[PDB]
C-alpha cells in the first residue's frame, strides 16, 4: 500500500520548558509547557509526557501513530525528545478531557455545544476511517478540549473498556470502523447525560448477555427521540446497519442548525462557556505566544 511519508520531529530538551504538572498516575506524568524553537520568536503551549526497553517501545509505537495523522479534529504529535527516557511533545488542550469538562460545566453546557461536539467527533472519526485507522478506544475521556468550541480525538495510539465496546468486539475481538460507531454512540450518551457512567453498578461480564437480550443505554432526559434514535442505530447487532461516520456528520450538522429542536435543556440561551470574546480568555511572558495549529503547518 501507500508509503507513510510523515515527518518525525526530534526536539532538543533546551527548546522546551515544563511549567507545571497537568496530571500524574500509573503511566508517569503529563506537564503543561512551552516550546520555544531555535530563533523563530514563537512560544507554543504544549503538553509533555515523560527506563525499561518495553515501555520505550510502547511510547515510540504511540509516537508513530500520532505523527502519521493531520486533521483539525484529531490530536497530533508535535515531536519527541530522546532524553534518558523518551518524551512526547503534543499541542496543549487547556481545558482537558471532555468527560471531566461536561461533569464540571453541566450548568453552562447548552444544546449548541453538545451538538457541535458530536459533529467534531464524527469528523475526526471519519478522517481516521479515510486513513484506515481504527480507534478501538473512543470514549469521552479520549476527547480533548482545545477551546470549549473546538474538541479533538486522542488515545488512538492503541490502534479492556467493555461498556464502550461493540458486540463483535466483546465476543469475537472484531474491531472495525463500524465497531468505532458503537463507541461513538456511547460517547454521545456520555455527553448527553453530562458525564454519567454507562451501565453504572452493572458488572462488565453481564454486558455481553444484556446486549444479546436487546437492552441498551437509557434515553437521556434532554434527548429528543431524533437524537436518541441515532444513538440506538449506533448500537445495532448488525454492523452494516449502523450509521457511517460521514452520515453522523450530516445528521448532527442538520440538528446543530436548530439545536433547541433536538435537545431540551432548562436554562439554555442564558448559558455561556469561555470563548475568545471573554476578557483575558488566553503566567509569565504571554508575548509571542502562538498555538500549534497556526505554527509551521504540515
Ligand atoms: C480542573 N482541571 C485541572 C487539569 N486540567 C487539565 C488540562 C489539560 C490537560 N491536558 C491533557 O490532558 C493533554 C493530553 N492528554 C492525553 C494524554 C497525553 C498527554 C501528553 C502527551 Cl505528550 C500525550 C498524551 C494530550 C495532549 N495535550 C493535552 O493538553 C490535562 C488536565 C483540566 C482542568
Q: Domain residues of the chain, as ranges?
A: 1-92, 93-280
Q: Show the cell assigned to 103.
A: 461533569
Pocket perturbation via mutation, ligand 1, pick of 47, 140, 151 by most ligand atoms within 8 A of CB: 47
| Largest CA-CA distance found in the chain, in angstroms, rounded | 63
* Cα angle value 42/44/48 (rounded, 5°): 140
Asked whether the beta carbons of 87 and 16 are under 8 A apart, the reply is no
Class of domain 1-92: alpha beta
Asked whether the beta carbons of 43 and 290 are under 8 A apart, the reply is yes
Pick the residue whose CA is nearest to atom 30 on ligand 1: 96
Q: Give the 3-state secondary structure of the chain.
A: CCCCCCCCCECCHHHEEEEEEEEEECCEEEEEEEECCCCCCCEEEEEEECCCHHHHHHHHHHHHHHHCCCCCCECCEEEEECCCCCEEEEECCCCCEHHHHHHHHHHHCCHHHHHHHHHHHHHHHHHHHHCCCCCCCCCHHHEEEEECCEEEECCCCCCCCHHHCCHHHHHHCCCCHHHHHHHHHHHHHHHHCCCCCCCCCCCCCCHHHHHHHCCCCCCCCCECHHHHHHHHHCCCCCHHHCCCHHHHHHHHHHHHCCHHHCECCCCCCCCCCCCCCCCCCCCCCCCCECCCCCCCCC
Asked whether the beta carbons of 212 and 184 are under 8 A apart, the reply is no
Q: CA–CA distance from 32 to each of 21, 22, 23, 178, 275 (Å)? A: 6, 6, 9, 35, 20
Tell me the Ramachandran region of residue 142: left when phi exceeds 0, alpha when psi lies from -120 to 50, beta otherwise: alpha
Q: How far is the C-alpha of 231 from the C-alpha of 1, rounded, in Å?
A: 34
Q: CA–CA distance from 237 to each of 183, 187, 188, 232, 248 (Å)? A: 13, 18, 18, 11, 18
Q: How was this structure determined?
A: X-ray
Asked whether the beta carbons of 94 and 33 are under 8 A apart, the reply is no
Q: How far is the C-alpha of 92 from the C-alpha of 75, rounded, in Å?
A: 10
Q: CA–CA distance from 151 to each of 123, 234, 250 (Å)? A: 11, 21, 18
Q: Which of 116, 39, 53 is nearest to 273 (CA)?
A: 116
CA of 88 to the centre of ligand 1 (A): 12
Pick the residue whose CA is nearest to atom 7 on ligand 1: 96
**Domain covering 93-280 in this structure, CATH number:** 1.10.510.10
* Cα angle value 116/93/86 (rounded, 5°): 135
Q: How far is the C-alpha of 269 from the C-alpha of 67, rounded, in Å?
A: 40
List ligand 1's pocket residues with C-beta within 6 A. Answer: 22-23, 30, 47-49, 75, 88-94, 96, 144, 154
Q: Show the cell assigned to 40.
A: 523563530
Tell me the Ramachandran region of residue 193: left when phi exceeds 0, alpha when psi lies from -120 to 50, beta otherwise: alpha
Q: How many CB atoms lie within 10 A of CB 71?
A: 17
Q: Which distant-in-sequence residues (6+ apart) come within 8 Å of 89 by Cβ?
A: 11, 16, 33, 35, 46, 47, 48, 77, 78, 79, 80, 81
CA of 97 to the centre of ligand 1 (A): 7
Residue 287: is it exposed, middle or buried by C-beta count within 10 angstroms (0-12/13-18/19+)? Answer: exposed
Q: Which of 99, 197, 186, 204 is nearest to 142 (CA)?
A: 99
User: Can you give the resolution of this entry in Å?
Assistant: 2.7
Q: Which distant-in-sequence residues (6+ apart) come within 8 Å of 108 by Cβ?
A: 271, 272, 273
Residues marked as catalytic: 137
Q: Which of 217, 191, 183, 24 is nearest to 100 (CA)?
A: 191
Q: Which of 118, 116, 133, 58 is nearest to 88 (CA)?
A: 58
Residue 252: is it exposed, middle or buried by C-beta count within 10 angstroms (0-12/13-18/19+)? Answer: buried
Q: Which of 196, 214, 80, 96 is nearest to 148 (CA)?
A: 96
Pick the residue whose CA is nearest to atom 21 on ligand 1: 49
Amino acid at each position: 500500500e501507500a508509503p507513510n511519508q510523515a515527518l518525525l520531529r526530534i526536539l532538543k530538551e533546551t527548546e522546551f520548558k515544563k511549567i507545571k504538572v497537568l496530571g500524574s498516575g500509573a503511566f508517569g506524568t503529563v506537564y503543561k509547557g512551552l516550546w520555544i524553537p531555535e530563533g523563530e520568536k514563537v512560544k507554543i503551549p504544549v503538553a509533555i509526557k515523560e527506563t525499561s526497553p518495553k515501555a520505550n517501545k510502547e511510547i515510540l509505537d504511540e509516537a508513530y501513530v500520532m505523527a502519521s495523522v493531520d486533521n483539525p479534529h484529531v490530536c497530533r504529535l508535535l515531536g519527541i525528545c530522546l532524553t534518558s527516557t523518551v518524551q512526547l511533545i503534543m499541542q496543549l488542550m487547556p481545558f482537558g478531557c471532555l468527560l471531566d469538562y461536561v461533569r464540571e460545566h453541566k450548568d453552562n453546557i447548552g444544546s449548541q455545544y453538545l451538538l457541535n461536539w458530536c459533529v467534531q467527533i464524527a469528523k475526526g472519526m471519519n478522517y481516521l476511517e479515510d486513513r484506515r485507522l481504527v480507534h478501538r478506544d473512543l470514549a469521552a475521556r479520549n476527547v480533548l478540549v482545545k477551546t470549549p468550541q473546538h474538541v479533538k480525538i486522542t488515545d488512538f495510539g492503541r490502534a479492556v473498556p467493555i461498556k464502550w465496546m461493540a458486540l463483535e468486539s466483546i465476543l469475537h475481538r472484531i474491531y472495525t470502523h463500524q465497531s468505532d460507531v458503537w463507541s461513538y454512540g456511547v460517547t454521545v450518551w456520555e455527553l448527553m447525560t453530562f458525564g454519567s457512567k454507562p451501565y453504572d453498578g452493572i458488572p462488565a461480564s453481564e454486558i455481553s448477555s444484556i446486549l444479546e437480550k436487546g437492552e441498551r443505554l437509557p434515553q437521556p432526559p434532554i434527548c429528543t427521540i431524533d437524537v436518541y434514535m441515532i444513538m440506538v442505530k449506533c448500537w445495532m447487532i448488525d454492523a452494516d446497519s449502523r450509521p457511517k461516520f460521514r452520515e453522523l456528520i450530516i445528521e448532527f450538522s442538520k440538528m446543530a442548525r436548530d439545536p433547541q429542536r433536538y435537545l431540551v435543556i432548562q436554562g439554555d440561551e442564558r448559558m455561556h462557556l469561555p470563548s475568545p470574546t471573554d476578557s483575558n480568555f488566553y503566567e509569565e511572558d504571554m508575548d509571542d505566544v502562538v498555538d500549534a495549529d497556526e505554527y509551521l503547518i504540515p
